[PDB]
Design an enzyme around this catalytic site. Structure first.
Site, mmCIF file in Angstrom:
data_model
loop_
_atom_site.group_PDB
_atom_site.id
_atom_site.type_symbol
_atom_site.label_atom_id
_atom_site.label_comp_id
_atom_site.label_asym_id
_atom_site.label_seq_id
_atom_site.Cartn_x
_atom_site.Cartn_y
_atom_site.Cartn_z
ATOM 1 C CE1 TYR A 99 0.926 -0.626 4.425
ATOM 2 C CE2 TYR A 99 0.505 1.713 4.259
ATOM 3 C CZ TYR A 99 1.030 0.643 4.939
ATOM 4 O OH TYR A 99 1.664 0.840 6.138
ATOM 5 C CG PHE A 153 0.296 9.276 5.662
ATOM 6 C CD1 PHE A 153 0.210 8.161 6.471
ATOM 7 C CD2 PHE A 153 -0.764 9.569 4.828
ATOM 8 C CE1 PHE A 153 -0.900 7.353 6.440
ATOM 9 C CE2 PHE A 153 -1.875 8.763 4.797
ATOM 10 C CZ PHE A 153 -1.943 7.655 5.602
ATOM 11 C CG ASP A 154 2.660 4.006 6.093
ATOM 12 O OD1 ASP A 154 3.873 3.751 5.960
ATOM 13 O OD2 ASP A 154 1.874 3.255 6.700
ATOM 14 C CB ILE A 195 -8.140 2.535 10.162
ATOM 15 C CG1 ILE A 195 -7.569 2.349 8.758
ATOM 16 C CG2 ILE A 195 -7.135 3.266 11.024
ATOM 17 C CD1 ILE A 195 -7.405 3.636 7.998
ATOM 18 C CE1 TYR A 244 -5.057 5.966 13.288
ATOM 19 C CE2 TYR A 244 -4.633 6.736 11.074
ATOM 20 C CZ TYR A 244 -4.375 5.864 12.103
ATOM 21 O OH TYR A 244 -3.428 4.883 11.952
ATOM 22 C CG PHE A 292 -4.691 4.004 2.414
ATOM 23 C CD1 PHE A 292 -3.431 3.747 2.910
ATOM 24 C CD2 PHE A 292 -5.603 4.647 3.224
ATOM 25 C CE1 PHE A 292 -3.088 4.126 4.185
ATOM 26 C CE2 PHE A 292 -5.264 5.028 4.498
ATOM 27 C CZ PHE A 292 -4.005 4.767 4.979
#
Lengths: 387, 49, 371, 107, 820
Positions: free
Chosen positions: D26, D36-37, D56, D82, D99
């Site tokens: 991902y 961010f990831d 999540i 979140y 994502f």
């Protein structure tokens, strides 16, 4: 106005320094003699030890310091043999009194009383007070003798500088308060004249005085200069020059710009407002830099400093002051808060990418090898995620 | 990083994507400015949008 | 006792291993004697390939030993609130002190050869700043006793032994050029911290020793607490030996300097400080004599404490003698107008009565000879 | 809620079921397009068991909505990702997450 | 966007970005693993690994990125391992048994000049592992409470790949330096070498490099010395001073490995030799007992050994260094020769027992350091200090072992798991020494203390605990939080309460532990000025634990410490409690609650094992009389009302609200002033009674004992003691219907107050006259005995007042009547 016998750290401060002034101009620097009349001047306040008919032993102003009130002498013993008089000498005279060795009793010439200590008042020792009010008494005690100790030239110069600087800055503050809230419209400033030139010159002189030693110096010389600098900073702070500089900064900060200042002080005075503000901030930074004791004083009034970061006239100077405080004082680090951190970040937002702001930002993160997790977390949460 | 592959048209005077940095996050190709119009299979690309 | 019969062969292997490690370190490793200090100093004092490097520069670069001494001088001169304990400095100070050995009928030639050897060994150090380093470290200790100042004093004694006039001159020049009150303030503070005979401590120690052995030595503490009476006698002797060696050879300049430091803003009279310590010590010894006067025979521990106090007093007397001999007339006057006469009166009283008491039992002949 | 948009087709039949260990690759971005990831930066597929509330809620639903070998874009609202708290220092409060997931295998 | 390599010419952006990297390093510094995990989202693993290899990166950015990788991923693990690297807990396992000083070689299996390669081989010292967690920003956030979640681990990064990359980069740097190019990576030799050397040093200390990797590093350092049984080595290249500093760090690591190897070899030999010694002693005992008593005196003299402490037996058995006869040391000659050979081998290894090419680590380090100092006037004081530390270690190798052994310790194989858990807990506690205390740190500290106190190795190996220095670390943490804002009401009371529970127990575990804590008495007494509001254990309680029931320590006490405590008591007797004033209590003008605590510490010092320590008792009495304010306002000379009047006034205060408390409450109003006053006076009378001299001294008629007793008798009248003993107590009663009207023990006059009066009466005045005995029985004792007897019903039997009366009667009253 009162005189005390006090011990402890005061023995290294400037409030325990006195100038011996014989009652003559010519050969006033001659050897001191037993029984020779003289005045005793407090250096940092410029006042004279004297006997008042109402308050007893006090320090009086020079305007009121006549010989009868303020003439003292040194006596080898308390015997009533002062009858034998002596004449002055045109020269250095014979050496009589020695530093440290000679033990001298102080006598008020006009009244014949002896300088002693008041009977220790009760409940003061119980609280913890260890200073004894000094008085003039008819007999005194057997341990009334005083030893005269020499002070360093640096200490004496600092004391005189404190006296003159305090006078000048107090006059400046009074001038500002004169027109504190009286707009001039289009007429005269409507107040007392300001010592702008004197204040500017004095601030420049004191910045040079407190200049840190040059990095390209031999280790020994640098260490000696650092010791002297720390001692001078401590002397000024103990005599209260830091509070005076802060008061001047407050009075000048009331105004938001040179034109706003001119509306109350006049264009001529306003032509130096920015320069005076910047010089005051530079002096504050010089006064606290590298001094843990001075820097820790801001732990109580950190808002006073952080709330000024966005002022546009002296932004770099204010940031330098904050940098010094945070570099030296863990106590400030332990009271920093989220609003303070947010103001420091808004500095980056509104003034641009300045690396000194980042240096400040993690002067908060660690100090003396100890980390503040709250400050680290607040910086991380308020600066990073926005990207 | 996902492979980049876009097909389309570009205007001669203005479409000059140099290697390396550029608009956005670099890797500028067809449809990363207002001089080119591209298709990538799922998206129509123009003005770096 | 007997019936319990606690045998080592019943202990678990790991307990026995720990006991063995402790005993082996105490008896075999610790007792081993290895003399590396001379070799180390000799290796460090050699410049290397100076001609190949063509060190035609008038100011030659310091050699490794010089650089070590300079590093410790810089550490001493750094402006700090207190002097941190430094194992490296203590180890190297011990090495430097040991490098100066201070080693029947000895021929005049042999005695002179020993003197010259010691002078060369001491020049190895004082030609590289060791004297100034010692003074700086004493000043930096700021009157706080401890291992750092003990090592500094031992190093100073090592380089001053025999009354090294060159070292004395270097020390005096450094002091008179710097004009810092810190050195003598530190000396005075150390002298005031120096201790004397304490009868309360003596009685406490007697009771602690009296406490019996009920449990096994490992579980109990063996009452091996360090000496409680005159525990720093070695430090006191070192301090006063250093002060004596500053004046050894009738160095008039340094004898006068110990009395009055004309150039400094304030002066401390080390002669009078020494007299004051001697007076405290005399009073403590008189107290000890009064404690033992009723008793018939002084026991072993009392004799040991008397002997320690007497060694310290001997060193103090030697220091005063060195101060005044030559003669230094100023020091003679300063002593004559001091509390020395009272100390001598008390000492005479103690001497007379201890002579008469110790002569009555031959088991105290060694104490009588020392007295 | 989570919206799923296919990027490359999968097999079409094999879907994750509760208790299975999904292996994915991902890349995560904020709605404004800030990365961010990414598991591909660490060069190691991310494994998580479906139904154990490890990831999540948006992920739990979206990946379950996918088939083996499929690549898809998941758009997840704040309440699913979140919420108000966010991820201190990584994801701002009340942030929508995009994502780019690929379901490599099921185990 | 631009290429980051444009910052080589855009210098303002370069400076800002380098300081940004510094800010990243600082927001995660000193164990903020949560922020490190956050930073893994801004500078990811691919970015860091690419920056490591980027040869065109400007020097400041290259250094910043190396430092950032270390700070994010390795700093915490490296620090935790470095803290443990100074201790040698050697388990007695087969690997330990196998360890030997010198490598098994053809020349010899032990003795030969050739050492093994440093840092290569088998080491068995216990070191807890490294713990990491994977970075991931899609996992569900733990929604539990804050400051209670498990501490975050450092984000993970593939360590085998990182090791290989570091080794390859160091090799490339060595080759490039040998080639002497004009474009060094980073712009200078320092910027090329210092970062990779820092990374290699960090990984070495973490202990991630394998034996082959360590061999490669050794060959890079010096190809000739560390050849395995190009040609230019780092130590022989011309390098700046910072590079020399990093080289010194590497040499320090390898010297530490050599020291550890010596310690472990000594431990293994100790195991084998102690086994042999025990086996021999068993045979000697068997043969001695089997003997048909040749001579009873001979048998007694022989068993003198076996009826001695094991430590003394070992000392006796190892006293053959300079020869000894079979009577002085019964150890067999073969067993003696074994130790002699091992001692020779140890001296040879250390170099004590006695080519321009070094040919050894020790000679290599000595030559390198001396050569550097000879070649240049070194300007970096840190470099100078490192150089001379290394040189000292090389020259004095036996001294290093001697100073290291105190930190060595052998354990059984069955204790290894629990020792590892204890080491992890101690590592957390030690890590908490570099961070300002907060809620999360407080919780972590409390949890670690609980785990240590629940671990068995804590109790069975107090010497190991002392060698590790647990007590000192916990004391330092406690004192840090106490001193921080000393004037302000100290925060985190629970942490200080735990700080005893741990230390105040540590003292009780063993006598040596008690002595070790007693050695810090002044420190604890210095920081004991604050407390009370603790309502728990305090540093004053730590101080009492150190001197409790220990005659040796009670005698070692210092008059300075007693004077400090007495000065605190004087302050408490002269000033009111600011905390109580703030909470709203009336201003009575003094602090009975603090006075009681100080009196309590004094009582432990004055009385040990049921007897008074005259040395301390006389000193305490003299200090108290020299500061009369320590006796409370009642015993004042001029305005004093007397002890009986004081107690009666306290009873009235307790009965009347608005004078006993704020009158506005977790512990039912916390402090009650009447009870506090009564407790202070009871504690004072107890302390004076315990300072009273012993009967044997009185019988011997010692002047000092008689004087002390007279002083105490003058302080406390007998009529006041009898009056207080005669004061009535409130007993539980049954009112209404089933209404147990129980007195509030924490707010009223209780028998514990009369117990102190009885103790003082019996020890100072004493009962010696039948008339006085009958009078005191009739007025004070018999009424209380009757009350206790009447409270023996099933309803009242277990009431608090009934149990208190039973304790009072059985501890003070009845023993006295038995004596009389």
């Amino acid at each position: 106005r009162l005189v005390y016998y006090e011990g402890g750290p005061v023995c290294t401060h400037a409030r325990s320094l006195w100038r011996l002034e014989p009652l003559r101009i010519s050969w006033s620097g001659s050897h001191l003699r037993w029984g020779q009349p003289l005045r005793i001047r407090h250096v940092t306040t410029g006042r004279y030890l004297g006997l008042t008919e109402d308050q007893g032993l006090v320090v009086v102003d020079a305007s009121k310091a006549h010989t009868k009130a303020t003439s003292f002498c040194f006596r080898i013993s308390k015997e009533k043999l002062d009858v034998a008089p002596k004449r002055d000498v045109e020269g250095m005279g014979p050496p009589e009194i020695k530093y440290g060795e000679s033990l001298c009793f102080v006598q008020h010439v006009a009244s014949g009383l002896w300088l002693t200590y008041a009977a220790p008042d009760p409940k003061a020792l119980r609280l913890g007070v260890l200073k004894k009010k000094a008085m003039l008494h008819q007999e005194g005690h057997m341990d009334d003798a005083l030893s005269l100790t020499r002070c360093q030239q640096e200490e004496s110069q600092a004391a005189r500088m404190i006296y003159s600087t305090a006078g000048l800055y107090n006059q400046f503050i009074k001038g500002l308060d004169s027109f504190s809230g009286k707009p001039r419209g289009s007429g005269p400033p409507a107040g007392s004249a300001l010592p702008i030139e004197g204040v500017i010159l004095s601030l420049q002189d004191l910045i040079g005085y407190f200049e840190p030693p040059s990095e390209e110096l031999q280790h020994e010389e640098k260490q000696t200069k650092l010791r002297s600098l720390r001692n001078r900073q401590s002397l000024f702070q103990e005599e209260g020059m830091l509070s005076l500089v802060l008061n001047c900064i407050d009075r000048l900060n009331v105004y938001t710009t040179a034109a706003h200042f001119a509306e109350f002080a006049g264009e001529e005075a306003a032509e130096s407002w920015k320069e005076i503000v910047n010089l005051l901030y530079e002096l504050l930074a010089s006064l606290i830099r590298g001094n843990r004791t001075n820097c820790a004083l801001f732990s109580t009034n950190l808002d006073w400093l952080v709330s000024k970061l966005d002022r546009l006239e002296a932004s770099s100077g204010i940031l330098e002051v904050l940098y010094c405080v945070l570099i030296e004082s863990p106590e400030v680090l332990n009271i920093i808060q989220e609003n303070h951190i947010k103001s420091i970040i808004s500095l980056l937002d509104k003034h641009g990418r300045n690396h000194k702001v980042l240096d400040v930002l993690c002067s908060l993160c660690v100090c003396n090898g100890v980390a503040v997790r709250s400050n680290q977390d607040l910086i991380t949460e308020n600066l990073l995620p926005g990207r | 990083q996902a492979t980049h592959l876009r097909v389309g048209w570009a205007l001669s005077e203005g479409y000059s994507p140099y290697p390396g940095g550029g608009e956005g996050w670099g890797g500028n190709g067809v449809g990363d400015d207002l001089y080119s119009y591209g298709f990538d299979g799922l998206h129509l690309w123009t003005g770096h949008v | 006792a007997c019936f319990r019969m606690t045998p080592l062969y019943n202990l678990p292997t790991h307990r026995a291993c720990n006991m063995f490690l402790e005993s082996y370190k105490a008896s075999w490793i610790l007792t081993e004697d290895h003399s590396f200090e001379d070799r180390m100093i000799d290796d460090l004092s050699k410049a290397g390939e100076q001609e190949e490097e063509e060190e035609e520069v008038e100011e030659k670069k310091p050699d490794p030993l010089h650089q070590l001494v300079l590093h410790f001088s810089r550490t001493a001169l750094t402006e700090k609130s207190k002097l941190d304990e430094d194992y490296l400095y203590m180890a190297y100070a011990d090495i430097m002190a040991k490098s100066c050995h201070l080693e029947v009928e000895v021929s005049f030639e042999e005695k002179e050869m020993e003197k010259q050897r010691l002078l060369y060994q001491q020049s190895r150090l004082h030609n590289r700043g060791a004297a100034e380093m010692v003074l700086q470290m004493i000043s930096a200790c700021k009157g706080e006793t401890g291992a750092m100042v003990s090592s500094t004093l031992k190093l100073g004694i090592s380089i001053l032994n025999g009354g090294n006039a060159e070292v004395q001159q270097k020390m005096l020049d450094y002091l008179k050029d710097k004009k810092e009150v810190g050195f003598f303030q530190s000396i005075q503070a150390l002298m005031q911290t120096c201790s004397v005979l304490d009868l309360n401590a003596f009685e406490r120690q007697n009771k602690a020793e009296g406490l019996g052995m009920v449990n096994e030595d490992g579980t109990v503490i063996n009452r091996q607490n360090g000496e409680k009476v005159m525990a720093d006698d070695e430090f006191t002797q070192d301090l006063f030996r250093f002060l004596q060696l500053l004046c050894e050879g009738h160095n008039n300049d340094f004898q006068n300097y110990l009395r009055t430091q004309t150039g400094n803003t304030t002066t401390i009279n080390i002669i009078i400080c020494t007299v004051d310590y001697l007076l405290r010590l005399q009073e403590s010894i008189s107290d000890f004599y009064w404690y033992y006067s009723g008793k018939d025979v002084i026991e072993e521990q009392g004799k040991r404490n008397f002997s320690k106090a007497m060694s310290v007093a001997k060193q103090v007397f030697n220091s005063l003698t060195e101060y005044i001999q030559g003669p230094c007339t100023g020091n003679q006057q300063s002593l004559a107008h001091s509390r020395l006469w009272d100390a001598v009166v008390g000492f005479l009283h103690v001497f007379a009565h201890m002579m008469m008491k110790l002569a009555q039992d031959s088991s105290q002949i060694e104490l009588l000879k020392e007295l | 809620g989570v919206q799923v948009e296919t990027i490359s087709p999968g097999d079409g039949r094999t879907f994750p079921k509760r208790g299975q260990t999904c292996v994915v690759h991902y890349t995560g971005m904020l709605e404004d397009g800030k990365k961010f990831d990414s598991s591909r930066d660490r060069n190691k597929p991310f494994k998580f068991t479906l139904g154990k509330q490890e990831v999540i809620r948006g992920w739990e639903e979206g990946v379950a909505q996918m088939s083996v070998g499929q690549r898809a874009k998941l758009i997840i609202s704040s309440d699913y990702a979140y919420g108000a708290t966010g991820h201190p220092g990584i994801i701002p409060p009340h942030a929508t997450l995009v994502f780019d997931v690929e379901l490599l295998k099921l185990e | 966007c631009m290429d980051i390599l444009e910052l080589s010419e855009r210098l303002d952006l370069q400076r800002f970005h380098s300081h940004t990297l510094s800010l990243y390093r600082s927001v995660c510094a000193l164990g903020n693993n949560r922020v490190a995990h956050a930073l893994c989202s801004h500078v990811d693993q691919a970015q860091l690994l690419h920056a490591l290899e980027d040869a065109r990166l400007p020097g400041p950015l290259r250094a910043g990125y190396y430092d950032l990788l270390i700070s994010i991923h390795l700093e915490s693990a490296c620090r935790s391992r470095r803290s443990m690297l100074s201790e040698y807990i050697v388990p007695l396992t087969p690997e330990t048994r196998a360890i030997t000083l010198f490598p098994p070689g053809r020349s010899a299996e032990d003795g030969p000049r050739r050492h093994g390669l440093p840092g290569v081989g088998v080491t068995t010292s216990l070191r807890p592992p490294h713990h990491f967690s994977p970075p991931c920003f899609v996992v569900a956030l733990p929604a539990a409470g804050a400051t209670e979640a498990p501490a975050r681990l450092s984000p993970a990064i593939p360590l085998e790949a990182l090791r290989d990359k570091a080794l390859r980069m160091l090799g490339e740097a060595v080759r490039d330096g040998g080639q002497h190019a004009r474009d060094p990576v980073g712009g200078s030799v320092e910027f090329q070498f210092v970062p990779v050397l820092k990374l290699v040093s960090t990984l070495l200390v973490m202990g991630v490099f394998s034996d082959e990797d360590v061999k490669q590093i050794l060959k890079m350092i010096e190809p000739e010395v560390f050849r395995e049984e190009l040609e230019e080595g780092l130590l022989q290249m011309k390098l700046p001073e910072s590079v020399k500093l990093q080289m010194c760090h590497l040499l320090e690591y390898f010297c530490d490995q050599e020291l550890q190897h010596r310690v472990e070899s000594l431990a293994a030999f100790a195991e084998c030799y102690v086994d042999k010694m025990q086996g021999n002693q068993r045979g000697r005992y068997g043969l001695l007992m089997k003997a048909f008593t040749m001579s009873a005196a001979e048998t007694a003299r022989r068993t003198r050994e076996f009826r001695s402490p094991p430590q003394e037996q070992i000392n006796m058995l190892l006293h053959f260094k300079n020869g000894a006869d079979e009577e002085e040391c019964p150890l067999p000659e073969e067993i003696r020769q074994e130790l002699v050979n091992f001692h020779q081998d140890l001296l040879a290894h250390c170099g004590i027992q006695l080519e321009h090419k070094p040919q050894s680590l020790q000679e290599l380090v000595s030559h390198t350091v001396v050569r550097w100092a000879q070649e240049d006037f070194v300007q970096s004081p840190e470099l100078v200090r490192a150089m001379f530390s290394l040189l000292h270690r090389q020259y004095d190798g036996l001294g290093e072992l001697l100073r290291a052994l105190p930190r060595a310790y052998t354990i059984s194989v069955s204790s290894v798991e629990d020792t590892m858990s204890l080491l992890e807990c101690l590592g957390q506690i030690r890590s908490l020494l570099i961070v300002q205390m907060g809620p999360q740190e407080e919780n972590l500290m409390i949890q670690s203390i609980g785990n240590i106190m629940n671990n068995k190795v804590f109790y069975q190996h107090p010497n190991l605990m002392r060698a590790l220095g647990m007590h000192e670390t916990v004391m330092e943490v406690m004192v840090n939080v106490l001193g921080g804002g000393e004037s302000k009401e100290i925060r985190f009371p629970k942490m200080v309460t735990s700080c005893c529970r741990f230390l105040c127990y540590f003292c009780r575990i063993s006598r040596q532990n008690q002595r070790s804590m007693f050695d810090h008495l002044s420190y604890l007494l210095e920081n004991s000025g604050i407390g009370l509001g603790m309502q728990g254990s305090t540093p004053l309680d730590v101080a009492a634990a150190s001197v409790i029931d220990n005659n040796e320590l009670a005698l070692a006490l210092q008059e300075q410490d007693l004077e400090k405590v007495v000065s605190y008591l004087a302050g408490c007797g002269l000033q009111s409690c600011p905390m109580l004033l703030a909470k709203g209590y009336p201003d009575i003008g003094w602090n009975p609650c603090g006075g009681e605590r100080y009196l309590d510490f004094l009582r432990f010092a004055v009385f040990v094992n049921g007897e008074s320590v005259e040395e301390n008792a006389n000193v305490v009495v003299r200090l108290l009389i020299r500061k009369p304010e320590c006796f409370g306002p009642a015993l004042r000379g001029e305005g004093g009302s007397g002890l009986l009047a004081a107690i009666e006034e306290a009873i009235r205060i307790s009965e009347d609200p608005a004078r006993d408390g704020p009158g506005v409450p977790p512990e039912e109003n916390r402090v009650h002033l009447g009870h506090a006053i009564m407790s202070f006076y009871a504690a004072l009378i107890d302390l004076l009674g315990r300072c009273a001299p012993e009967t044997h001294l009185i019988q011997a008629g010692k002047g000092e004992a008689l004087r002390i007793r007279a002083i105490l008798r003058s302080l406390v009248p007998l009529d006041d003691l009898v009056g207080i003993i005669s004061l009535p107590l409130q007993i539980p009663t049954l009112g209404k219907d089933g209404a147990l009207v129980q007195p509030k023990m924490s707010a009223s006059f209780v028998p514990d107050h009369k117990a102190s009066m009885v103790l003082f009466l019996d020890r100072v005045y004493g009962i010696e006259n039948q008339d006085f005995l009958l009078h005191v029985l009739d007025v004070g004792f018999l009424p209380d005995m009757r009350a206790a007897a009447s409270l023996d019903t099933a309803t009242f039997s277990t009431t608090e007042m009934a149990l208190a009366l039973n304790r009072y009667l059985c501890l003070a009253v009845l023993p006295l009547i038995t004596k009389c």
